[PDB]
Amino acid sequence: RFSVAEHQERYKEECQRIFDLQNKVLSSTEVLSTTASVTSLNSSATGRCLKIYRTFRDEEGKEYVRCETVRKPAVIDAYVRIRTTKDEEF
Amino acid sequence: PHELESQFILRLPPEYASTVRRAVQSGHVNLKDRLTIELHPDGRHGIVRVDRVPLASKLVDLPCVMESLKTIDKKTFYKTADICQMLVSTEKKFIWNHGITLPLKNVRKRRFRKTAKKDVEKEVKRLLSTDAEAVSTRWEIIAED
């Protein structure tokens, strides 16, 4: 609890141990056998997906509407961020 | 101008690797006729022909980054290029999980932090391009559907 030496000593010993472990891992000629478990994020914090109905005009005369759903939360974030920016860009 | 040289690693089957190694250490131009490399317009597929025998190749991405370092006195080493690709001969398939050295195997699965790699943004660009043609847009929360 005496940071003067306790904090300095423990931090130094931890750093030395980490360095020794890294050196041992680098020096191993042991052959390892041919994705590690990770937390799986939900489709965003809100658990939502992004859809988009949209109108266009075909050759001759037509007015078809396309509804497209984006379930990729990565595509979502980048998509929305531009609109919110373009909404403020006016 | 100067263009940075592009070095990659070629991995061969072990008998063909022994013949290519013997022909390289010999040093004649006979090796030049014997060893050819044809890279297909896929960009991730090829043939390596050892002694006119075709072998099927894939250009894969390596999980670590290697750097070639040349020297004249073996005390100071100058970085010459970055190596990140290997033309193993015999997308997710074009990514190699293991590293070249023995301590690094499946470095991607175990010794790599899983912050992220990359795809999602090219899809975003395509989505914005499709969005451009819109008059009435409809988007909702969505649940278990």
Side-chain angles (χ1 to χ4, degrees), chain B residues 12-138:
Chain B
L12 283 151
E15 37 178 21
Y16 294 112
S18 90
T19 69
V20 173
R21 171 165 318 276
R22 171 193 330 161
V24 161
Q25 294 177 336
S26 159
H28 296 114
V29 285
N30 179 19
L31 162 71
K32 175 170 174 57
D33 335 333
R34 293 160 37 99
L35 185 49
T36 72
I37 291 181
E38 181 162 16
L39 213 66
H40 283 266
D42 203 297
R44 322 289 276 197
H45 280 87
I47 301 185
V48 185
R49 225 173 310 272
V50 172
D51 279 304
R52 279 52 187 276
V53 168
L55 294 171
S57 294
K58 277 191 291 217
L59 186 78
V60 298
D61 280 305
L62 293 176
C64 319
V65 46
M66 282 177 287
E67 45 172 22
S68 301
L69 264 73
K70 79 184 289 191
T71 188
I72 316 298
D73 45 71
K74 286 182 183 43
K75 289 171 159 38
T76 317
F77 292 83
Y78 295 82
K79 182 185 181 165
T80 79
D82 270 297
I83 313 171
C84 55
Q85 266 169 337
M86 195 166 58
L87 189 58
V88 193
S89 300
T90 283
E91 284 296 347
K92 174 207 58 57
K93 192 50 225 61
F94 307 132
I95 264 177
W96 204 253
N97 301 315
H98 330 288
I100 275 191
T101 61
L102 272 188
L104 301 180
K105 212 128 145 350
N106 32 297
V107 221
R108 223 150 196 157
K109 308 320 183 187
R110 185 264 305 196
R111 257 223 171 205
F112 275 173
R113 30 178 4 177
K114 310 232 165 193
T115 58
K117 324 226 300 250
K118 201 14 231 101
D119 309 16
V120 175
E121 177 190 2
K122 169 195 307 180
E123 281 144 12
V124 171
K125 295 162 186 172
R126 169 188 179 181
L127 257 301
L128 182 51
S129 175
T130 46
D131 166 34
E133 341 129 11
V135 164
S136 8
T137 270
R138 174 86 217 106

Side-chain angles (χ1 to χ4, degrees), chain A residues 22 25-26 28-36 38 47-56 66 68 70 72 74-75 78-79 82, chain B residues 98 102-106 109-111 114 119-121 123-124 126-128 130-143:
Chain A
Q22 174 183 349
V25 170
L26 290 177
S28 85
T29 61
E30 177 207 0
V31 33
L32 237 95
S33 125
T34 281
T35 259
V38 281
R48 283 183 200 192
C49 290
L50 218 284
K51 334 182 345 257
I52 19 233
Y53 281 53
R54 284 124 153 218
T55 322
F56 75 99
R66 319 169 317 287
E68 306 188 16
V70 160
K72 294 180 180 182
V75 175
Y79 188 88
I82 292 190
Chain B
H98 330 288
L102 272 188
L104 301 180
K105 212 128 145 350
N106 32 297
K109 308 320 183 187
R110 185 264 305 196
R111 257 223 171 205
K114 310 232 165 193
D119 309 16
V120 175
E121 177 190 2
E123 281 144 12
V124 171
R126 169 188 179 181
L127 257 301
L128 182 51
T130 46
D131 166 34
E133 341 129 11
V135 164
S136 8
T137 270
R138 174 86 217 106
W139 134 97
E140 83 125 330
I141 297 180
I142 105 122

